[PDB]
């Protein structure tokens, strides 16, 4: 497996990536894949021999200081786990080598994953984050051993009780 | 003065609404008025102006972002009268009740501290998090204290978004009643 910087001018890459997309979430492929081909992003590829197994991107939203985490996608597979993590690794690579202080990203808990969903997140709101509990592993946790912390919380973003979580990470040294 | 929602075949309130923004912030809209103007009047974003004697005064915008339920308030601006204040507060309460129309549940936001405008800026904001968020202080007049009294809670911040100790401080607020 080699983790690269995706090459925009592979079409069936390109399609891979819009297949994958389409069958992770049936939540349409096209749009989005020519979206995350931006030149302002920075889009990483994770392929075995000529077959394209994870994908990760960036959108800068704070100048060149703040990069938003989106989207990462791994095929279901063995070592899922293993590649998503190579992947985000390179990534934080990636932003801190043109300048980045921090990557962020939303995590939603649409299917009481967490803790965080169904309770009313304005009581008491921070109390509840740093209580929080994963129920069905949820990917937040996944992001949470790679050193994101959850920083902020969405109350009833994508439905009651169903709030997308935030999480962030500062990936260089801070200036001593 | 008279809120309501914006005309989007009105050019002279387009244009209107591209000197504001470029007047009012010429750092972001001096060359990507138009432009931004255009993306602001999508059909599927909410777009409200303020006028007062036919000269555009403020204008409020609002971003689904979670499907018709989470919207996010970009942009809100307001030329600089005595009147801003209000001219804003205002627009918000239109805004909120337009999102509400459409089966928005909840508006958040982003106001960023650049310059020692809270006490969340110029400290590591990953040392005490919530406690520092909790016992935020306003310094030099932060918005963030405009959208606090209109009932918008500080829900995140994100340490050193627009670099070190520079961070963003995220408001949201739930403008229907809970459901029972």
Redesign the interface.
């Given at each position: 497996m080699i983790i690269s910087e995706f090459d925009r001018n592979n079409p069936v890459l390109k399609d891979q990536l819009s297949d994958l997309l389409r069958l992770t979430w049936p939540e349409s492929s096209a749009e989005e894949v020519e979206e995350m081909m931006n030149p302002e992003r920075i889009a990483v590829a994770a392929v075995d021999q000529d077959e394209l197994v994870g994908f990760i991107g960036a959108i800068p939203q704070?100048?060149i200081?703040?990069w938003e985490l989106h989207p990462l996608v791994v095929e279901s597979s063995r070592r899922k786990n293993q590649i998503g993590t190579r992947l985000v690794n390179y990534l934080e690579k990636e932003v801190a080598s043109r300048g980045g202080?921090?990557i962020?990203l939303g995590t939603?808990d649409l299917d009481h994953g967490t803790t965080l969903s169904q309770t009313?997140?304005?009581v008491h709101?921070?109390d509840k984050?740093?209580s929080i509990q994963n129920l069905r592993e949820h990917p937040y946790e996944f992001y949470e051993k790679l050193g994101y912390?959850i920083?902020?919380?969405?109350?009833?973003?994508?439905?009651?009780d169903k709030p997308?979580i935030?999480m962030?990470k500062?990936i260089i040294p801070?200036?001593d």
């Open positions: 704070y100048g200081t703040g202080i921090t962020y939603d009313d997140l304005y709101t921070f984050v740093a912390k920083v902020g919380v969405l109350p009833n973003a994508n439905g009651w997308d935030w962030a500062t801070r200036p």
